[PDB]
Nucleic acid binder design. Structure first.
Ligand SMILES: CC[C@H]1OC(=O)/C=C/[C@H](C)[C@@H](O[C@@H]2O[C@H](C)C[C@H](N(C)C)[C@H]2O)[C@@H](C)C[C@@H](C)C(=O)/C=C/[C@H]2O[C@@H]2[C@]1(O)CO[C@@H]1O[C@H](C)[C@@H](O)[C@@H](OC)[C@H]1OC
Ligand SMILES: [Mg+2]
Ligand SMILES: [Mg+2]
Ligand SMILES: [Mg+2]
Ligand SMILES: [Mg+2]
Ligand SMILES: [Mg+2]
Ligand SMILES: [Mg+2]
Ligand SMILES: [Mg+2]
Ligand SMILES: [Mg+2]
Ligand SMILES: [Mg+2]
Ligand SMILES: [Mg+2]
Ligand SMILES: [Mg+2]
Ligand SMILES: [Mg+2]
Ligand SMILES: [Mg+2]
Ligand SMILES: [Mg+2]
Ligand SMILES: [Mg+2]
Ligand SMILES: [Mg+2]
Ligand SMILES: [Mg+2]
Ligand SMILES: [Mg+2]
Ligand SMILES: [Mg+2]
Ligand SMILES: [Mg+2]
Ligand SMILES: [Mg+2]
Ligand SMILES: [Mg+2]
Ligand SMILES: [Mg+2]
Ligand SMILES: [Mg+2]
Ligand SMILES: [Mg+2]
Ligand SMILES: [Mg+2]
Ligand SMILES: [Mg+2]
Ligand SMILES: [Mg+2]
Ligand SMILES: [Mg+2]
Ligand SMILES: [Mg+2]
Ligand SMILES: [Mg+2]
Ligand SMILES: [Mg+2]
Ligand SMILES: [Mg+2]
Ligand SMILES: [Mg+2]
Ligand SMILES: [Mg+2]
Ligand SMILES: [Mg+2]
Ligand SMILES: [Mg+2]
Ligand SMILES: [Mg+2]
Ligand SMILES: [Mg+2]
Ligand SMILES: [Mg+2]
Ligand SMILES: [Mg+2]
Ligand SMILES: [Mg+2]
Ligand SMILES: [Mg+2]
Ligand SMILES: [Mg+2]
Ligand SMILES: [Mg+2]
Ligand SMILES: [Mg+2]
Ligand SMILES: [Mg+2]
Ligand SMILES: [Mg+2]
Ligand SMILES: [Mg+2]
Ligand SMILES: [Mg+2]
Ligand SMILES: [Mg+2]
Ligand SMILES: [Mg+2]
Ligand SMILES: [Mg+2]
Ligand SMILES: [Mg+2]
Ligand SMILES: [Mg+2]
Ligand SMILES: [Mg+2]
Ligand SMILES: [Mg+2]
Ligand SMILES: [Mg+2]
Ligand SMILES: [Mg+2]
Ligand SMILES: [Mg+2]
Ligand SMILES: [Mg+2]
Ligand SMILES: [Mg+2]
Ligand SMILES: [Mg+2]
Ligand SMILES: [Mg+2]
Ligand SMILES: [Mg+2]
Ligand SMILES: [Mg+2]
Ligand SMILES: [Mg+2]
Ligand SMILES: [Mg+2]
Ligand SMILES: [Mg+2]
Ligand SMILES: [Mg+2]
Ligand SMILES: [Mg+2]
Ligand SMILES: [Mg+2]
Ligand SMILES: [Mg+2]
Lengths: 61, 93, 74, 110
RNA sequence: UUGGAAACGCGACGGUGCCAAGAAAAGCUUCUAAACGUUGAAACAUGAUUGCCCGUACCGCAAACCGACACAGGUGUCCGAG
RNA sequence: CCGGAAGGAGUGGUGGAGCCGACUGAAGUGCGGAUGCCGGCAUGAGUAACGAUAAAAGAAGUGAGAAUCUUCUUCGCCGUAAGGACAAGGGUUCCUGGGGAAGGGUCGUCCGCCCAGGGAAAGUCGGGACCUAAGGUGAGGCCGAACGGCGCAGCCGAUGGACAG
RNA sequence: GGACCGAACCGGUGCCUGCUGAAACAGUCUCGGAUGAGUUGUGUUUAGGAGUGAAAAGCUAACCGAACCUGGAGAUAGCUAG
RNA sequence: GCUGGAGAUACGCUUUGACUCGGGGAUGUCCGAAUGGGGAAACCCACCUCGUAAGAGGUAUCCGCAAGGAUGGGAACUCAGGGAACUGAAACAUCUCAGUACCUGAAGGAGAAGAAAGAGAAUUCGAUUCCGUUAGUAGCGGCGAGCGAACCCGGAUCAGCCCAAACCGAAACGCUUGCGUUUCGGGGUUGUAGGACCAUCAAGCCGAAGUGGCUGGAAAGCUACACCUCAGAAGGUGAGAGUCCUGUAGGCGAACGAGCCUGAGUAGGUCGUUGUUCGUGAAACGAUGACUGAAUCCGCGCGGACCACCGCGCAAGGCUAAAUACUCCCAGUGACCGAUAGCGCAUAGUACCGUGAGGGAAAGGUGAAAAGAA
């Protein structure tokens, strides 16, 4: 997951953001049948931002 | 980014039966300048918007017993796009 | 603040008004009518040290500054 | 509010294990550990049973029924067995699963 | 439609008299300093894109505001026909 | 029942998990009073009152239940108001669908009450990204046991100026 | 025109009524002013031995010859209760 | 196993080690010292740079060249500037309450003070602080009410160290010519006068020993035999368990985390005052606000007017652990409380009252197990 380029960090961040907003639309419809999918996308965004921070501090020193 | 500013669509007899006129209507982050929610809905649904109007809206209830209540606030937008521009199946409702 | 430059906060001290006025000189003694607080202050000249300045000065400061600069000077 | 279990939130047995009640009714009875609840100290077993008349909510059942279901206990079913009765037990050694300790009383393993 | 009435509103920054003698600052219209410009300026016209933030519900002479009350009290302005 | 007193025991009833007796020691140790304190319950008494002397009547409807809710037709009362539009202030009281314990001076199927859902849209109206008044504040500056007090430019400040339906 | 009558408005003259009120200052009736020393909104400034006051020791957030709150503080109580 | 209190259904996560615990990192909107500017706290308006925008960073004053430092907060404690009255004196002025209350400033985990120009009457001691004691002594006092030391002696703790100056080498700016004001090394730091210059604790793991019968709804109780004990502290479990559970008796334990000179506007003095037992008293001494104003080793301060003698010290420069205080916080304990008690609160500074500062409640209990009554 760290292997990706940071341009792919932006892409795979934005895809989770879009899916998260789509899950929200659904849930506001009331038909949110898979609640765990939300938290899964959120933690995935968390891991993504954290790994990019680790490539921040790493290398440049 | 766009996606998290747009919040969740309105659901009512009004905004739905106003979906048929070509208007679309949904909640957003209260801190959100009109032009931002315009660009966000535009580049989330691939439509060009020629009209927006925005209103801040504040609720408040109270769960039984001592607990005072006070539901959280928000803001709502209504948009009108160019005649053909009507948004897709997520407008399908 | 009245603080002088290498000077003086200006102190307080109760002022005593005594009456009988005949202590060691052969007499009954010396009663006291009242004490009450007081203070003071003092003068205001102007001299400089780095580039330019104008400060408060006491008579002790005017006296010491004629003997020599110290730090600030006329 | 009274606080929970004082047993350092430590169950003395897994949900897998066979076990026997050693007190109250059901003393001597045995079964598999269908539910362990360490922090509340509670143990599901096929021993104790109770007829719970769930109140009718028409939730597929207009008129309600009476289910037969087992009602949990705690650190009163005794731990694992081996010479056919409850036992004190001790930490052991390494196995082919050498990252593990097992158990024993005056005997083997569990 | 015809006839009539009429404002404290409009024409207004009208008239006349009076003494106790009746804000400021920006927008605004003129002038130049400085600067760029003096081939490509001002301004005009036509088309286009552009239009941010907050307030708008309801009570509001009162049962929804101040009066411990679904209180004979109090509450600034505006319209208020025959 | 017992002891001279403060008091003590027997027995039976409740109750559901801690407790007598003796000796010694330590006390926040003994209540009728304090217009004492907190709390509970009485009397006055089914009494006074039900909050403007602007009246109300019948039919029909709904409902477990109606003098009081809805509908119809009449009646009476305000009409420089007891109509209407705002600012202040209040804070969802607005609309729909339900409810009926408690609030409502009676009732209640109703409500400004309880529950849930919706409703609030501005380039042009008011304010802000414009302006300044009283007043406030204020680098520098003038004072002052401390904290602090003043004070030019400047800045803030509508109750006013400017401004496109 | 610190002129007259008189609504609004500001006020509070005499009587009654109210007195566990409709209201901790009111109501009906009556009465004073009503272009002025007038009435009123918003903003703002002055306070405790201090402010204000066409002057009553009035007013200074419902009882002001010295406000409220906290504190010194369990003030002191030759007095009364218990 | 987990999926916070929460007592709730659904979606699920977890031997690839979740959850919980110990330790580090990273993210951390807006307000608040708040600090780009304004502002009615959490809001309204900008400008500069980087960026494809989205986004990121900077923009307060005050010390500094600069690194860097300061704004604010903190229960009680510490120091400091300022500083009451009620009250006692059976009235009240001095006096007392009392340098108490309170305000303000500065700081830390403590602070303050501190290394004799002293204490004191033995030619004794030897920084400071705190405790005991002297001692209600000596004293102060409308000699009234009342206030009140210190030395010696016993203990806790105990260290003393650095500067300016004579004299060398400048170097810059000082002047009629091998010198003199602020700087930088050396040098030099005092009274029985010296220096000069010259002969373990954090997470945690391991841990001994009981079975039968009996009353019971249920056993830990009764009873019969039996065991451990460096472990009989304690809680839990259907009523009271050494041996059923959890257990410092004992034992082990981490990545990596805490612990010639010697001080001048000075000493001294006069005027106004004050601390100390010190109320003007014969009033020394310290401390000062105004004015004045010296000596320096046959030198200067002190020994309670003052003088001589005798005796104790070396001011006018700085730093300084520990014995001391306090309890926001944590652990253990109690002839403390146990629901009108105990904090105000079995939790809430809430509800409620006040424009505000501010004030401010009561309130506990199914059962062993929800088996919570189809
Ligand atoms: C009747 C009107 C008021 O009473 C009086 O004036 C007087 C009543 C007594 C006769 C008198 O007694 C007498 O004293 C004498 C010294 C001695 C004599 N002895 C010989 C017996 C004795 O008889 C007093 C002191 C007795 C005492 C209990 C008292 O202080 C009562 C106070 C107030 O409640 C009463 C009122 O009724 C309240 O009426 C108010 O009027 C306002 C205008 C209203 O706005 C309203 O205020 C909102 C309203 O309510 C407050
Ligand atoms: Mg529009
Ligand atoms: Mg005095
Ligand atoms: Mg201007
Ligand atoms: Mg409207
Ligand atoms: Mg509103
Ligand atoms: Mg009313
Ligand atoms: Mg009026
Ligand atoms: Mg008219
Ligand atoms: Mg008319
Ligand atoms: Mg008896
Ligand atoms: Mg029991
Ligand atoms: Mg008592
Ligand atoms: Mg009594
Ligand atoms: Mg008695
Ligand atoms: Mg009572
Ligand atoms: Mg009445
Ligand atoms: Mg019927
Ligand atoms: Mg009817
Ligand atoms: Mg009626
Ligand atoms: Mg009606
Ligand atoms: Mg009909
Ligand atoms: Mg009206
Ligand atoms: Mg409003
Ligand atoms: Mg309604
Ligand atoms: Mg009812
Ligand atoms: Mg109900
Ligand atoms: Mg009723
Ligand atoms: Mg009734
Ligand atoms: Mg309704
Ligand atoms: Mg708007
Ligand atoms: Mg301005
Ligand atoms: Mg001005
Ligand atoms: Mg000022
Ligand atoms: Mg000014
Ligand atoms: Mg305006
Ligand atoms: Mg306009
Ligand atoms: Mg405007
Ligand atoms: Mg339009
Ligand atoms: Mg007139
Ligand atoms: Mg009057
Ligand atoms: Mg009137
Ligand atoms: Mg008349
Ligand atoms: Mg007249
Ligand atoms: Mg006076
Ligand atoms: Mg008053
Ligand atoms: Mg009040
Ligand atoms: Mg008084
Ligand atoms: Mg008292
Ligand atoms: Mg006192
Ligand atoms: Mg007295
Ligand atoms: Mg739970
Ligand atoms: Mg700011
Ligand atoms: Mg900054
Ligand atoms: Mg600021
Ligand atoms: Mg003093
Ligand atoms: Mg006295
Ligand atoms: Mg302080
Ligand atoms: Mg501080
Ligand atoms: Mg000693
Ligand atoms: Mg036994
Ligand atoms: Mg002197
Ligand atoms: Mg003197
Ligand atoms: Mg005297
Ligand atoms: Mg002497
Ligand atoms: Mg002296
Ligand atoms: Mg002597
Ligand atoms: Mg010396
Ligand atoms: Mg007790
Ligand atoms: Mg209590
Ligand atoms: Mg009670
Ligand atoms: Mg209130
Ligand atoms: Mg309030
Ligand atoms: Mg329970």
């Amino acid at each position: 997951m760290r292997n990706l380029q940071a341009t792919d960090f932006a892409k795979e961040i934005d895809a989770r953001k879009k899916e998260l907003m789509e899950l929200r639309f659904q849930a506001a419809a009331g038909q949110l049948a898979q609640p765990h999918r939300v938290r899964q996308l959120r933690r995935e965004v968390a891991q993504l931002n954290t790994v990019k921070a680790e490539l921040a501090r790493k290398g440049e020193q | 980014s766009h996606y998290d500013i747009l919040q969740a669509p309105v659901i009512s007899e009004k905004a739905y039966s106003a979906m048929e006129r070509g208007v679309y209507s949904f909640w957003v982050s209260p801190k959100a300048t009109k032009t931002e929610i315009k660009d966000a809905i535009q580049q989330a649904f691939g439509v060009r918007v020629i009209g927006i109007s925005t209103m801040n809206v504040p609720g408040k209830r109270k769960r039984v017993g001592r607990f005072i209540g006070q539901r959280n606030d928000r803001k709502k937008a209504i948009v009108r796009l160019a005649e053909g521009q009507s948004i897709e199946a997520l407008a399908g409702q | 603040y009245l603080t002088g430059k290498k000077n003086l906060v200006v102190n307080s001290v109760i002022r005593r008004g005594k009456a009988r006025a005949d202590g060691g000189v052969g007499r009954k003694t010396t009663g006291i009518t009242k004490r009450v607080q007081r203070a003071n202050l003092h003068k205001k000249a102007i001299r400089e040290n780095g580039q330019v300045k104008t400060v408060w000065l006491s008579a002790n400061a005017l006296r010491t500054l004629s003997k020599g600069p110290y730090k600030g000077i006329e | 509010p009274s606080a929970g279990s004082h047993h350092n939130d430590k169950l003395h047995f897994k949900k897998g294990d066979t076990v026997i009640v050693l007190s109250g009714k059901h003393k001597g009875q045995t079964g598999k550990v269908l539910l362990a609840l360490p922090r509340d100290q509670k143990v599901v077993v096929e021993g104790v049973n109770v007829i719970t008349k769930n109140v009718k909510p028409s939730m597929t059942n207009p008129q309600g029924g009476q289910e037969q279901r087992e009602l949990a206990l705690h650190a009163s079913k005794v731990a694992l067995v081996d010479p056919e009765t409850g036992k004190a037990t001790r930490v052991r050694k390494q196995i082919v699963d050498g990252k593990k300790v097992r158990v024993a009383v005056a005997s083997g393993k569990t």
